[PDB]
Amino acid sequence: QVQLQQPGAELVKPGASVKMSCKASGYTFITYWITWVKQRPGQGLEWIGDIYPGGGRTNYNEKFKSKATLTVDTSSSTAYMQLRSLTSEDSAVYYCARYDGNYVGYYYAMDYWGQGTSVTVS
Amino acid sequence: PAYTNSFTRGVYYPDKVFRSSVLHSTQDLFLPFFSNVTWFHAIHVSNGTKRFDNPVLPFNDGVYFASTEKSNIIRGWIFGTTLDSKTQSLLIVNNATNVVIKVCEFQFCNDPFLGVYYHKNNKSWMESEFRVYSSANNCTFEYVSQPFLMDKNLREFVFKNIDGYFKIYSKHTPINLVRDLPQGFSALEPLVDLPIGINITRFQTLLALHRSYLTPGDSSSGWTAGAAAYYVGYLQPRTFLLKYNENGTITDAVD
Amino acid sequence: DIVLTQSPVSLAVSLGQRATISCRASESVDFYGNSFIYWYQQKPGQAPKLLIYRASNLESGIPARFSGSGSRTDFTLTIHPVEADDVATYYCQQSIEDPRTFGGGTKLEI
Amino acid sequence: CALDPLSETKCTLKSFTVEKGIYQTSNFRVQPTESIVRFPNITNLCPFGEVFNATRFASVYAWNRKRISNCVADYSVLYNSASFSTFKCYGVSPTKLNDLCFTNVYADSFVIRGDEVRQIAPGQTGKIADYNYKLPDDFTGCVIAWNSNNLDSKVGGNYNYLYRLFRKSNLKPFERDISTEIYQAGSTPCNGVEGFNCYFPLQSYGFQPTNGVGYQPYRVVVLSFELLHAPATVCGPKKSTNLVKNKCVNFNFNGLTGTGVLTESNKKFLPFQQFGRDIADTTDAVRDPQTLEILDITPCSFGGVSVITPGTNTSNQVAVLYQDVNCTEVYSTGSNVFQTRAGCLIGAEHVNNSYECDIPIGAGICASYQT
Ligand SMILES: *[C@@H]1O[C@H](CO)[C@@H](O)[C@H](O)[C@H]1NC(C)=O
Ligand SMILES: *[C@@H]1O[C@H](CO)[C@@H](O)[C@H](O)[C@H]1NC(C)=O
Ligand SMILES: *[C@@H]1O[C@H](CO)[C@@H](O)[C@H](O)[C@H]1NC(C)=O
Ligand SMILES: *[C@@H]1O[C@H](CO)[C@@H](O)[C@H](O)[C@H]1NC(C)=O
Ligand SMILES: *[C@@H]1O[C@H](CO)[C@@H](O)[C@H](O)[C@H]1NC(C)=O
Ligand SMILES: *[C@@H]1O[C@H](CO)[C@@H](O)[C@H](O)[C@H]1NC(C)=O
Ligand SMILES: *[C@@H]1O[C@H](CO)[C@@H](O)[C@H](O)[C@H]1NC(C)=O
Ligand SMILES: *[C@@H]1O[C@H](CO)[C@@H](O)[C@H](O)[C@H]1NC(C)=O
């Protein structure tokens, strides 16, 4: 039922900007937060930021405050992730997930995940 | 107006300081030793002809109130810089229950009193209605506490207002001589500090009136207020010396 | 920022045996009896899949073999029995205070 | 003169060779290990129970608003409440609620059905969200809801709760509309009489015990936090640290902010008196804000450091002398520790044998170089 999709891969020139989508379906998009996790190839998981589609409330990580510019489009139920000033260290796979953000239930649990996008900067 | 000597009363503790057999000096508003205290009579029975006089005495940075009524006829003290709804004013009421501290803008009537009536069913004097003020505006602060007056025993209620703080100090001591304040030394224990934060210039004593006093007939046959009498003294800024025992109870003072 | 360490990094467990994964938190995660630690399983070439939420409850659709424990700084995840298709990377995540951080990850070998 | 106490004496007297005697080279001080802070039991609790646990809640279209200020927001009771079904906070971490301060707190309470709980959130749509209770996009606060079938429903059907079914315009954020004007659904005017194109804007909820959780009444309380430039009036209550005795610490008892060691006392204070002073107008003892006891406050032990040395041309060994301080608060310790009325001297073996006095120490104790 619940389906979350991301583009397969993206190629961007160094010093440019890339804007990729996070398409969610099968559930009410506005009622669930959209969080983002960065995973370097062969490394662990790093959190970037989370956004609530209803109202556009954002919360960016201190490390990625100047790197991540995140916007959502509730009309298409899709979240757009924009990256700027990309370098060789930014070549990684980015995963968008959802969490209900309920202290009673699941708190920050990420039950559903997107397929992810392999971003290569060269 | 009748005048009576102060007779070395009204010494109260400095705010929250303790010593042990230590002689220490303080500089604050205190009652004069061997002062001259106006023994005003609020109501005198003259039939039971009404003699109702509660003169609006200025506060003048402190008042020393002494009550000798055994029926708790004295019930409240009204404070205000102008005693109108233009500025906030302090209202004190002391039933045989929790005290109601009321500080709001009040259009005060000529004769403030708390309407109390005797009920045939309950056989008790519960308050009928409040007829002290017309309106209550800017009601910011409301405090509740146990009654001050409880149970021939002289009571000392010294009142001050400093730094936007209203402070009261109380002491209860039996007296054989009702007419005259005894030539004995008694401390005034701190009780509670109130952050009223309003200017006070005029001090007025409130006397609760029974339903008989509030009957259409002026004569109050059921309840008599002739025994009501309140002492009033005025404080001044002179250094005093206090002696503390090992218990910490103030025993004597010298001007 | 709370850092999470997972040991052992490389673990080998035979068929039907018990696999032990421990996640250590640099700061306390318990909050009024609630521990906010999550265990994720990431198959190669696929997104991580949540197994245990709040370090003590089983996510729907996850086999009962996966089980977690621990509190405050130390958390332990136990898988029993361990099957052939359990070869993946397990990550522990804390969420008591922002920013949320993940563990270093562990490798399971059959 | 940082090497050894004998070198310290050489440093003080500015001479390589020092004659036999006693010299004050420095002073000893006990640095406090840590700081301690205690506050009394907090009584200015915010009326959380008054808002959350109220017998009667108003309708969603007439949601009650409660302003909370000049008190401490104790969320511990909210955390310990296990009957809550939804606890989502926007713009604030639920675990950080007690650690954050807000200028003003507004409490909104109403009753809605189970399936309409999700409508109380920023950016949501629906009947309740648009016509009964609308939240702003940048709303900062938490949404709390729980089942209320036992109290908001009865056998005969509780219709006391109403929702705004029809409204000409969507509600603005934080807008409470209680108008009962007849809704005009067509060109024909209503003139205060409902008809074909005129319907009541409010519809009574049908609450029954057997409706189910999907259609059961839910008590919803919404707390909104605003951050303005005015001084904060809602802050988390302070935490009282564990009491310490017989150990020198830094104590701040509601503003005393003194230094020293706290010890159990025997003196009794006035029921109102908290802390006392000496003749010299210095802090003497403080009463516990938590319990009812008196603790003596002596200042941290400190005194001059003395060195006992014989003639450097005769010997090269020295014995430290710590005056006016007992050996417990202490060349390092562990080498023939001896205690005297003058203090704790370290480095000399005490002997009962009595000789003629050579070097002054105090209280009838004299030290000399012998076998
Ligand atoms: C002072 O006290 C005397 C009696 O001691 C009294 O006659 C007099 O009226 C009082 N007041 C003044 C202003 O003298
Ligand atoms: C006592 O008087 C007060 C007036 O402030 C009133 O509120 C209270 O109910 C009275 N107590 C009774 C009637 O028992
Ligand atoms: C202080 O109180 C104690 C206990 O009642 C008493 O024994 C002692 O005599 C008092 N000190 C005085 C009266 O100076
Ligand atoms: C009502 O009960 C207690 C306080 O009486 C507390 O848990 C909270 O204020 C309320 N509980 C719920 C579940 O609403
Ligand atoms: C404060 O609460 C504790 C815990 O119940 C209690 O032991 C202590 O007596 C209380 N102190 C005051 C002054 O209320
Ligand atoms: C004292 O020092 C002098 C050096 O100036 C030395 O000649 C003498 O022997 C020394 N005497 C003793 C008793 O140490
Ligand atoms: C050190 O001080 C005195 C000695 O005069 C005595 O209380 C004890 O020996 C020591 N104090 C302690 C251990 O608290
Ligand atoms: C010194 O006197 C003490 C006193 O009891 C005794 O215990 C100790 O044995 C004596 N030592 C010598 C060497 O006389």
Side-chain angles (χ1 to χ4, degrees), chain B residues 3-5 36:
Chain B
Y3 291 77
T4 293
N5 63 7
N36 206 349

Side-chain angles (χ1 to χ4, degrees), chain D residues 234-260:
Chain D
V234 176
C235 280
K238 296 294 298 302
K239 296 183 290 294
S240 57
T241 55
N242 183 34
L243 188 153
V244 287
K245 292 190 202 185
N246 313 333
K247 189 173 164 246
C248 63
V249 299
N250 291 334
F251 54 108
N252 181 25
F253 282 100
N254 311 340
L256 269 296
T257 175
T259 64

Side-chain angles (χ1 to χ4, degrees), chain D residues 40-41 43 288-292:
Chain D
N41 300 11
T43 61
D288 180 20
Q290 295 297 109
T291 70
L292 269 76

Side-chain angles (χ1 to χ4, degrees), chain A residues 48-120:
Chain A
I48 297 173
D50 50 346
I51 185 166
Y52 197 70
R57 172 165 293 283
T58 60
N59 178 38
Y60 295 98
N61 202 338
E62 294 176 352
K63 184 177 180 290
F64 294 98
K65 60 179 180 180
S66 69
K67 165 82 58 187
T69 49
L70 189 73
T71 51
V72 294
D73 196 356
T74 52
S75 74
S76 63
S77 282
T78 313
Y80 291 85
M81 173 48 156
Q82 186 185 1
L83 293 172
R84 45 179 306 269
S85 306
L86 293 175
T87 60
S88 65
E89 314 168 332
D90 301 310
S91 297
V93 190
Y94 304 86
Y95 293 94
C96 70
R98 70 152 205 176
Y99 68 90
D100 60 343
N102 190 354
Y103 179 82
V104 170
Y106 293 163
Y107 192 71
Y108 267 95
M110 294 182 286
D111 54 338
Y112 278 93
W113 283 65
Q115 278 317 301
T117 301
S118 196
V119 172
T120 306

Side-chain angles (χ1 to χ4, degrees), chain D residues 112-119 128 205 212-216 218:
Chain D
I112 59 173
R113 48 195 266 189
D115 47 43
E116 286 171 348
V117 175
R118 70 204 59 158
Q119 289 187 45
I128 293 309
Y205 273 119
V213 291
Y215 197 50
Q216 257 172 24
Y218 272 58

Side-chain angles (χ1 to χ4, degrees), chain B residues 91-101 114 116 124-128 130:
Chain B
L91 192 173
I92 307 285
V93 65
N94 204 78
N95 189 359
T97 57
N98 46 354
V99 178
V100 171
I101 301 299
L114 279 299
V116 57
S124 54
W125 277 93
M126 71 295 278
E127 298 272 354
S128 50
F130 302 163

